[PDB]
Amino acid sequence: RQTGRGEGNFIIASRNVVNVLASVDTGISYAAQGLATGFSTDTTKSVFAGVL
Amino acid sequence: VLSLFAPWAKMDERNFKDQEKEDLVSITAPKLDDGAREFEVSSNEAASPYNAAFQTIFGSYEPGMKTTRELIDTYRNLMNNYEVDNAVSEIVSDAIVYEDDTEVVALNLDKSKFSPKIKNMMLDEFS
Amino acid sequence: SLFAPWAKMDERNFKDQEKEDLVSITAPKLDDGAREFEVSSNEAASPYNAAFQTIFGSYEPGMKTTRELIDTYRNLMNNYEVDNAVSEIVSDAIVYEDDTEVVALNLDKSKFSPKIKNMMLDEFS
Numbered sequence A: 001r002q003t004g005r006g007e008g009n010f011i012i013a014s015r016n017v018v019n020v021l022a023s024v025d026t027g028i029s030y031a032a033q034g035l036a037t038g039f040s041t042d043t044t045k046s047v048f049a050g051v052l
Numbered sequence B: 001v002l003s004l005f006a007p008w009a010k011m012d013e014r015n016f017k018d019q020e021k022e023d024l025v026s027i028t029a030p031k032l033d034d035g036a037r038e039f040e041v042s043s044n045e046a047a048s049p050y051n052a053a054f055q056t057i058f059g060s061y062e063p064g065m066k067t068t069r070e071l072i073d074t075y076r077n078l079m080n081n082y083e084v085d086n087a088v089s090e091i092v093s094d095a096i097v098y099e100d101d102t103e104v105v106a107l108n109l110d111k112s113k114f115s116p117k118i119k120n121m122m123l124d125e126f127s
Numbered sequence C: 001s002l003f004a005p006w007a008k009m010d011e012r013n014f015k016d017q018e019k020e021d022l023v024s025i026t027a028p029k030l031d032d033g034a035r036e037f038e039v040s041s042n043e044a045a046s047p048y049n050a051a052f053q054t055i056f057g058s059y060e061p062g063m064k065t066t067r068e069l070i071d072t073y074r075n076l077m078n079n080y081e082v083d084n085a086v087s088e089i090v091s092d093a094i095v096y097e098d099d100t101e102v103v104a105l106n107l108d109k110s111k112f113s114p115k116i117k118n119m120m121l122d123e124f125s
Helices: A015-022 B003-020 B050-061 B065-078 B085-095 B116-126 C004-018 C047-059 C064-077 C083-093 C114-124
Strands: none
Touching: none
16 A cells, blocks of 8 residues: 555565464464474575465 | 476476376385486475475585586596597497488387378478 | 285295195205394294394494495496496397397297286286
8 A cells, every 4th residue: 555566475584473474374264273384494495485 | 486497397297296196105215217316305295395496406416516527527538538539439420320312310100100190290390 | 014915925925834834844945045034933932132133243244245245346347348248248148139029928838828828928018
């Protein structure tokens, strides 16, 4: 609403923020928590974990 | 994923799906024989997101480019020596024979194939 | 359990030998082969003590015999005028020519039926 060219499409965050994101679903659903899965959170190898 | 390889990526994906659907399980050693050097990957059950692959390729390329570099340069230097280059020359001459009013290696469909119509098209493409 | 379906036959084969009357033999049934490991049956009273000593006793040389020999054989083959021997043998041993035969099954003895011969030939291919 401040640009009108489109809604945010990326997040950059601390590891802790990511640990949460990486370990929960994003899907609209009942609930879900586990170990990080799809998101590669190891900064040793990447900087890019995945897409929420 | 660089766009220059888009259709090739799709071809590989299709081949992978067939492998995934097969019974080639109970493998104590990866079923490779020669050529390419392997690498043990994260294997998140089966997953390797492209971004995981990106580091994976760096970590495959570093420990050994030097070896390749030394061997190739060595071979090229050997190739510039007296009576070495000649070995290659004679090998090349016989391996690739090409003369006046003569053919080149060409497709020879002398065994059963789907159809002569296709055989002719295959030959033209081979050319 | 990756080869459990194979093991099923192997277990049977072993049992068929246990149920066989090839007994009262002082000699080993060893012609040319594998490293020998020996334990009692005795309701499995101590196969594990023997196994651990055997395993670590084998670890001691670390299969250096096999290891050194294969590496040696390769290092030998890697030499000039050595590969030639190997390659000539292989060449003479395995022969390919234009549209010719390669190793092939030849069922020239009595067989149960021609159909089986065909099955075997297809499997050979």
